[PDB]
């Protein structure tokens, strides 16, 4: 009903800051849920895999 | 004895400007006729207050 309309988005992300770079979306249809964040993953810290 | 004189004004718009004015909040046809009325009414003052 007016030129130049808009549309919003509702990305849901974990992490302390929901705007910091590298944040992973929670309910991503492709990406799986990080099924340790709510549990054991919160207590300890699993090292990240890389090469070598 | 005096002979009457003429005062003329003309602004015009474009349909695109008129279309958004209703969307933007105003009432385009009524507003424009009020634009001419105010200036012409004001333009009379400059012909009277500057004639005295």
Cβ distance of B24 and A1 shorter than 8 Å: no
C-alpha distances (whole Å) from B34 to each of A26, A37, B9, B10, B23 are 55, 64, 13, 13, 19
Q: Where are the alpha helices (DSSP H) in A1-52?
A: 40-43
CB distance B20 to A2 below 8 Å = yes
- For residue B23, the chain A residues in CB contact (below 8 A) are 1-3
Residue A14, Cβ neighbours under 10 Å: how many?
13
Instruction: Give me the long-range contacts of B46-49 (CB less than 8 A, separation at least 24).
Output: B47/B7
Say whether A25 sits in a helix, a strand or coil: strand
Give which of B19, B26, B30 is closest to A4, Cα–Cα: B19
Experimental method reported for this structure = cryo-EM
B28-48 helix and B15-24 helix, angle to the nearest 10 degrees: 100
DSSP state letters, B25-51: TS-HHHHHHHHHHHHHHHHHHHHHTTT
Resolution of the experimental model in angstroms, please? 3.9
Nearest chain B residue to A4, by CA: B20
Q: For residue B32, give every residue at least 6 positions away whose Cβ sits within 8 Å of its Cβ, in sequence order, or none.
A: B11, B13
- For chain A, counts of helices (H) and of strands (E): 1, 0
A5 touches B: beta carbon within 8 Å: no
Structure tokens at A10: 């509702």
């Amino acid at each position: 009903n007016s030129p130049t309309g808009q549309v919003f988005a509702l990305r849901a992300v974990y992490g302390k800051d929901p705007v910091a770079a590298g944040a992973k979306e929670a309910f991503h249809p492709m990406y799986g849920p990080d099924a340790m964040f709510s549990g054991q993953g919160a207590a300890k810290k699993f090292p990240a895999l890389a090469a070598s | 004895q005096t002979a009457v004189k003429s005062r003329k004004l003309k602004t015009g718009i474009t349909v695109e400007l008129a279309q958004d004015l209703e969307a933007n909040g105003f009432d385009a046809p009524n507003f424009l006729e009020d634009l001419l009325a105010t200036e012409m009414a004001d333009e009379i003052n400059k012909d009277i207050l500057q004639s005295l």
